[PDB]
Amino acid sequence: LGRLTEETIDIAREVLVEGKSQSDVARERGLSRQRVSSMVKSVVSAANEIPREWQRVEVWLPPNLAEKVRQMEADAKADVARKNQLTDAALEHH
Amino acid sequence: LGRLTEETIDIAREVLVEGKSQSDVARERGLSRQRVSSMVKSVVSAANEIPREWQRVEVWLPPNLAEKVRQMEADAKADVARKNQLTDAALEHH
């Protein structure tokens, strides 16, 4: 929900609100399966405020190491935030 | 599926095969909600071959660190295996 074409928002909205399968929607608009699935993916990663190359992982493990993995995530997410505001300033003269 | 009472297997089998909610099954047998949910949990962790105190975690993160987390799991799982066979031998005389 930011800077995206109008078509990307209209396709994507019909599967995540009022739940319909991806296959059916291909035939009605006349698009490949590969491309309807690349449209849904860039709206999900924009609602999370993270780049598009990051991946999703899920495992079982003991309780001490289960805490160290929760912390890797939280610190890495606030580091993109700081480093992004700095390069916006550098392009406003000064 | 190993060394468990007969009741624990008969309750647990009715929710995971032929899918029924946990609430309904409480009333018919006359047990609390807390205890039907502690019966289902020890059959799942026995099909994984891991202790009952381990926890389940799921996060998003960059592609290099996404590999190091996949490897923590695999090594920790083969370490319980080796250390278990050793204490069985020590109790067989010698």
Numbering used by the authors:
A (entry chain A), B (entry chain A): 13 to 106
From the paper:
ArdK is a 102 amino acid protein encoded by the broad host range conjugative plasmid R388. In R388, ArdK represses the expression of five genes by its binding to their respective promoters (PardC, Porf7, Pssb, Porf12 and Porf14). The KorA family of transcriptional regulators includes plasmid-borne repressors involved in plasmid stability and conjugation. Our structural analyses show that ArdK, a member of this family, can form a symmetric dimer similar to that observed for KorA, yet it binds direct sequence repeats as a non-symmetric dimer.
ArdK was crystallized as described in the Materials and Methods, and resolved to 3.0 Å resolution. In the crystal of the apo structure, there is a single ArdK molecule in the asymmetric unit. This molecule contains an N-terminal HTH domain (residues 1–62) and a C-terminal domain with a C-terminal α-helix (residues 75–102) connected by a linker region (residues 63–74). The C-terminal domain forms a β-sheet with its symmetry-related molecule. Thus, the biological assembly is very probably a dimer containing two HTH domains (α1–α4) and a dimerization domain (DD, β1 and α5). In fact, according to S75 gel filtration data, the protein purified as a dimer in solution. The structure of the HTH and DD domains in ArdK is strikingly similar to the structure of these domains in KorA. Both the HTH and the DD of ArdK show a root mean square deviation (RMSD) of 0.83 Å and 1.35 Å with their respective homologue domains in KorA. Comparison between both structures revealed that both dimers are symmetrical, but the orientation of the HTH differs: in ArdK, the HTH domains are rotated 150° with respect to their position in KorA. As a consequence, the electropositive N-terminal ends of the recognition α4 helices point towards each other in KorA, whereas they are pointing in opposite directions in ArdK.
